[PDB]
Amino acid sequence: SMDDDQVAFSFILDNIVTQKMMAVPDSWPFHHPVNKKFVPDYYKVIVNPMDLETIRKNISKHKYQSRESFLDDVNLILANSVKYNGPESQYTKTAQEIVNVCYQTLTEYDEHLTQLEKDICTAKE
């Protein structure tokens, strides 16, 4: 957490969110938790809400020690959209672009994230 490997790892994840996932066109509705004022039934239907701001807060708190836990929350954003909006909703297509560019960027950074993950895991000993 305070160690530089965790901080460097969190920094890379935050940059994927801000530079790539939040840059997806029309992605604003995913940037923050759903507003109940405009979507009144949302929290009755979706039991485990997730959004990009919540992911960034988790990164800031160093919640993620590897990409598997990060991806679990990223994929939950899409899972909720399929359930709430439907599999062919414009909003679900946006969520899929967000998820897709996240995976693509992780791949571009693989060798580097792999090293940080290994060292973070090593230090947990």
Coordinates of all heavy atoms in Angstrom, one line a residue, residues 92-123, unseen atoms left out:
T92 N -25.4 -0.4 -22.9 CA -24.7 -1.6 -22.7 C -23.6 -1.7 -23.8 O -22.5 -2.1 -23.5 CB -25.6 -2.8 -22.8 OG1 -26.4 -2.9 -21.7 CG2 -24.8 -4.2 -23.0
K93 N -23.8 -1.1 -25.0 CA -22.8 -1.1 -26.0 C -21.7 -0.1 -25.5 O -20.5 -0.4 -25.7 CB -23.3 -0.7 -27.3 CG -24.2 -1.8 -27.9 CD -24.7 -1.6 -29.3 CE -25.8 -0.6 -29.3 NZ -26.2 -0.5 -30.7
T94 N -22.0 1.0 -24.9 CA -21.0 1.9 -24.3 C -20.2 1.1 -23.2 O -18.9 1.2 -23.2 CB -21.7 3.1 -23.8 OG1 -22.3 3.8 -24.8 CG2 -20.6 4.1 -23.1
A95 N -20.9 0.5 -22.3 CA -20.2 -0.3 -21.3 C -19.3 -1.3 -21.9 O -18.2 -1.6 -21.4 CB -21.2 -1.0 -20.3
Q96 N -19.6 -2.0 -23.0 CA -18.8 -3.0 -23.6 C -17.6 -2.3 -24.2 O -16.5 -2.9 -24.1 CB -19.6 -3.8 -24.7 CG -20.6 -4.7 -24.1 CD -21.4 -5.5 -25.1 OE1 -22.3 -4.9 -25.8 NE2 -21.1 -6.8 -25.3
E97 N -17.7 -1.1 -24.8 CA -16.5 -0.4 -25.2 C -15.5 -0.1 -24.1 O -14.3 -0.2 -24.2 CB -16.8 0.8 -26.1 CG -15.6 1.6 -26.6 CD -14.8 0.8 -27.6 OE1 -15.3 -0.1 -28.3 OE2 -13.6 1.1 -27.7
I98 N -16.1 0.4 -23.0 CA -15.3 0.6 -21.7 C -14.6 -0.6 -21.3 O -13.4 -0.6 -21.0 CB -16.2 1.1 -20.6 CG1 -16.7 2.6 -20.9 CG2 -15.6 1.0 -19.3 CD1 -17.9 3.0 -20.1
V99 N -15.3 -1.8 -21.2 CA -14.7 -3.0 -20.8 C -13.6 -3.4 -21.8 O -12.5 -3.8 -21.5 CB -15.7 -4.1 -20.6 CG1 -15.1 -5.5 -20.5 CG2 -16.5 -3.8 -19.2
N100 N -14.0 -3.4 -23.1 CA -13.0 -3.8 -24.1 C -11.7 -3.0 -24.1 O -10.6 -3.6 -24.3 CB -13.7 -3.7 -25.5 CG -14.8 -4.8 -25.6 OD1 -14.9 -5.7 -24.8 ND2 -15.6 -4.7 -26.7
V101 N -11.8 -1.7 -24.0 CA -10.6 -0.9 -24.1 C -9.8 -1.1 -22.8 O -8.6 -1.0 -22.8 CB -10.9 0.6 -24.3 CG1 -11.3 1.3 -23.0 CG2 -9.6 1.3 -24.9
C102 N -10.5 -1.4 -21.7 CA -9.7 -1.8 -20.5 C -8.9 -3.0 -20.7 O -7.7 -3.0 -20.4 CB -10.7 -2.0 -19.3 SG -10.0 -2.5 -17.8
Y103 N -9.4 -4.1 -21.2 CA -8.7 -5.3 -21.5 C -7.5 -5.1 -22.5 O -6.4 -5.6 -22.3 CB -9.6 -6.4 -22.0 CG -10.3 -7.2 -20.9 CD1 -11.6 -7.0 -20.6 CD2 -9.6 -8.3 -20.3 CE1 -12.2 -7.9 -19.7 CE2 -10.2 -9.1 -19.4 CZ -11.6 -8.9 -19.1 OH -12.2 -9.7 -18.2
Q104 N -7.8 -4.3 -23.5 CA -6.8 -4.0 -24.5 C -5.6 -3.2 -23.9 O -4.4 -3.5 -24.2 CB -7.5 -3.1 -25.6 CG -6.5 -2.5 -26.6 CD -6.4 -3.4 -27.8 OE1 -7.2 -3.4 -28.7 NE2 -5.3 -4.2 -27.8
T105 N -5.9 -2.3 -23.0 CA -4.8 -1.5 -22.4 C -4.0 -2.3 -21.4 O -2.8 -2.1 -21.4 CB -5.4 -0.2 -21.8 OG1 -6.3 0.5 -22.8 CG2 -4.3 0.8 -21.4
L106 N -4.7 -3.1 -20.6 CA -4.0 -4.1 -19.8 C -3.0 -5.0 -20.6 O -1.8 -5.2 -20.1 CB -5.0 -5.0 -19.0 CG -5.8 -4.3 -17.9 CD1 -6.9 -5.3 -17.4 CD2 -4.9 -3.8 -16.8
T107 N -3.4 -5.4 -21.7 CA -2.5 -6.2 -22.6 C -1.3 -5.4 -23.1 O -0.2 -5.8 -23.1 CB -3.3 -6.7 -23.8 OG1 -4.3 -7.6 -23.3 CG2 -2.4 -7.5 -24.8
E108 N -1.6 -4.1 -23.5 CA -0.5 -3.3 -23.9 C 0.5 -3.1 -22.8 O 1.7 -3.1 -23.1 CB -1.0 -1.9 -24.4 CG -1.6 -2.0 -25.9 CD -2.7 -0.9 -26.3 OE1 -3.0 0.0 -25.4 OE2 -3.2 -1.0 -27.4
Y109 N 0.1 -3.1 -21.6 CA 0.9 -2.9 -20.4 C 1.3 -4.2 -19.6 O 1.8 -4.2 -18.5 CB 0.2 -2.0 -19.3 CG -0.2 -0.6 -19.8 CD1 -1.1 0.1 -19.1 CD2 0.3 -0.1 -21.0 CE1 -1.5 1.4 -19.5 CE2 -0.1 1.2 -21.4 CZ -1.0 1.9 -20.7 OH -1.3 3.2 -21.2
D110 N 1.2 -5.4 -20.3 CA 1.2 -6.7 -19.6 C 2.5 -7.0 -18.9 O 2.6 -7.3 -17.7 CB 0.9 -7.8 -20.6 CG 0.9 -9.2 -19.9 OD1 0.2 -9.3 -18.9 OD2 1.5 -10.1 -20.4
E111 N 3.6 -6.8 -19.6 CA 5.0 -7.2 -19.1 C 5.2 -6.4 -17.9 O 5.8 -6.9 -16.9 CB 6.1 -6.9 -20.2 CG 6.2 -8.0 -21.2
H112 N 4.8 -5.1 -17.9 CA 5.0 -4.2 -16.8 C 4.1 -4.4 -15.6 O 4.5 -4.2 -14.5 CB 4.8 -2.8 -17.4 CG 5.5 -1.7 -16.6 ND1 5.5 -1.6 -15.3 CD2 6.4 -0.7 -17.1 CE1 6.3 -0.6 -14.9 NE2 6.8 0.0 -16.0
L113 N 2.9 -4.8 -15.9 CA 1.9 -5.0 -14.8 C 2.2 -6.4 -14.2 O 2.0 -6.6 -12.9 CB 0.5 -5.0 -15.3 CG 0.0 -3.6 -15.6 CD1 -1.4 -3.7 -16.4 CD2 -0.2 -2.8 -14.3
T114 N 2.7 -7.3 -15.0 CA 3.1 -8.6 -14.5 C 4.2 -8.5 -13.5 O 4.2 -9.2 -12.5 CB 3.5 -9.5 -15.7 OG1 2.3 -9.7 -16.5 CG2 4.0 -10.9 -15.2
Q115 N 5.2 -7.6 -13.8 CA 6.3 -7.4 -12.9 C 5.9 -6.8 -11.6 O 6.3 -7.3 -10.5 CB 7.4 -6.6 -13.5 CG 8.6 -6.4 -12.6 CD 9.4 -7.8 -12.3 OE1 9.7 -8.2 -11.2 NE2 9.7 -8.5 -13.4
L116 N 5.1 -5.8 -11.6 CA 4.5 -5.2 -10.4 C 3.7 -6.2 -9.6 O 3.8 -6.2 -8.3 CB 3.7 -3.9 -10.7 CG 4.5 -2.7 -11.3 CD1 3.5 -1.7 -11.8 CD2 5.5 -2.2 -10.3
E117 N 2.8 -6.9 -10.2 CA 2.0 -7.9 -9.6 C 2.8 -9.0 -8.9 O 2.5 -9.3 -7.7 CB 1.1 -8.7 -10.5 CG -0.2 -7.9 -10.9 CD -0.9 -8.4 -12.2 OE1 -0.3 -9.3 -12.9 OE2 -2.0 -8.0 -12.5
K118 N 3.9 -9.4 -9.5 CA 4.8 -10.4 -9.0 C 5.5 -9.9 -7.7 O 5.5 -10.6 -6.7 CB 5.9 -10.8 -10.0 CG 7.0 -11.8 -9.5 CD 8.0 -12.1 -10.6
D119 N 6.0 -8.7 -7.8 CA 6.7 -8.1 -6.7 C 5.7 -7.7 -5.5 O 6.1 -7.9 -4.3 CB 7.4 -6.8 -7.1 CG 8.6 -7.2 -8.0 OD1 9.1 -8.3 -7.9 OD2 9.1 -6.3 -8.7
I120 N 4.5 -7.3 -5.8 CA 3.5 -7.0 -4.7 C 3.2 -8.3 -4.0 O 3.1 -8.4 -2.8 CB 2.2 -6.4 -5.3 CG1 2.5 -4.9 -5.7 CG2 1.1 -6.5 -4.3 CD1 1.4 -4.4 -6.7
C121 N 3.0 -9.4 -4.8 CA 2.7 -10.7 -4.3 C 3.9 -11.3 -3.5 O 3.7 -11.7 -2.3 CB 2.3 -11.7 -5.4 SG 1.9 -13.4 -4.8
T122 N 5.1 -11.2 -4.0 CA 6.3 -11.5 -3.3 C 6.4 -10.9 -1.9 O 6.6 -11.6 -0.9 CB 7.6 -11.1 -4.0 OG1 7.8 -11.9 -5.3 CG2 8.9 -11.4 -3.2
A123 N 6.2 -9.6 -1.8 CA 6.3 -8.8 -0.6 C 5.2 -9.2 0.5 O 5.4 -9.1 1.7 CB 6.2 -7.3 -0.9

